Design a protein around this ligand. Sequence first.
Ligand SMILES: Nc1ncnc2c1ncn2[C@@H]1O[C@H](COP(=O)(O)OP(=O)(O)O)[C@@H](O)[C@H]1O
Ligand SMILES: [Mg+2]
Length: 356
Amino acid sequence: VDQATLDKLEAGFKKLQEASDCKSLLKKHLTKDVFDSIKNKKTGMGATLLDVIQSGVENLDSGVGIYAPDAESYRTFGPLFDPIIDDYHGGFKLTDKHPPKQWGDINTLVGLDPAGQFIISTRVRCGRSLQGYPFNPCLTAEQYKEMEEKVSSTLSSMEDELKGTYYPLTGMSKATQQQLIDDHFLFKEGDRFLQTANACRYWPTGRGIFHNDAKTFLVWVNEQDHLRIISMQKGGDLKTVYKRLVTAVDNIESKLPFSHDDRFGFLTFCPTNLGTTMRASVHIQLPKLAKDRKVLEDIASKFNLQVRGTRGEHTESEGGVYDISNKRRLGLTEYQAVREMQDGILEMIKMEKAAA
Ligand SMILES: Nc1ncnc2c1ncn2[C@@H]1O[C@H](COP(=O)(O)OP(=O)(O)O)[C@@H](O)[C@H]1O
Ligand SMILES: [Mg+2]
């Protein structure tokens, strides 16, 4: 590691230390011991601690603050990643390994809000990384195009309910784009956290979205992760959604080689999406419970659930419509994941009905 980098590090580190009110895990876990113990390290791909904690430093309002420029970054900086992974995922010790992929008894999932007086839509998604391809930061424009090609081609062979068209971002009308985003279908553009993390170079080359006409099955190409296989729909039928997602992932897993770590499961760019890479969610209304986002989030936390704004993370709720999803992703099976979201949302419903 050269001096410059080391300078910005000592600098950044000092910055964090001076943010009396910063509540990101980065701050909470980057101690001087941890710092000095790795700051000099570098990976086979010259990825350095600056390339890991940078977004955290520049975006103090971060919750997590770090990223893995590449698989190696996960062990090379273990001293840091380790406690963070453990903190975020609700306990994942050093000796702890991640359980084998397991969808579970799809038939044990239920409709979340029968009367339909709270839940607007149910989304469930996963993330995958193409073997032989590092994460965003270490990518080359030529590589974004390569990955785009492999994915779209594979997806071209999707049949039945999963059959669809791949729409590159490059050449997409602002209108079409803005709409797809407004309908919660396509990823947002210009995320500050992803930018300072250097995960948007050569944008929008290689970026895109594949989806069945119904738009109930989609696949994000080259945003935060190489792939984001999604299944969503209006209503609260988790069963259908999950079942659809499963049919999708497995099918795709049979055609593309995905990165899977024995200790972290399927690997992702952000430490928060490792393991099952699963985030089950619903856009739900809870007038009485949400009378204050504080107590609402406090409730959510008791169920290992996370509260986001209507347009995604780092947004505000639009019309008392919040994004409640399962927080933890690593350290439990796919089934346990969708399960934490299902259980939490059923009780929250009950609690809402019992509120004055
Ligand atoms: N239950 C849901 N229904 C509709 N859209 C949702 C729902 N859950 C998540 N989303 C959408 O996912 C998109 C990306 O949001 P984000 O919070 O970054 O989640 P992720 O990257 O995990 O998919 C946003 O457009 C958000 O509104
Ligand atoms: Mg996101």
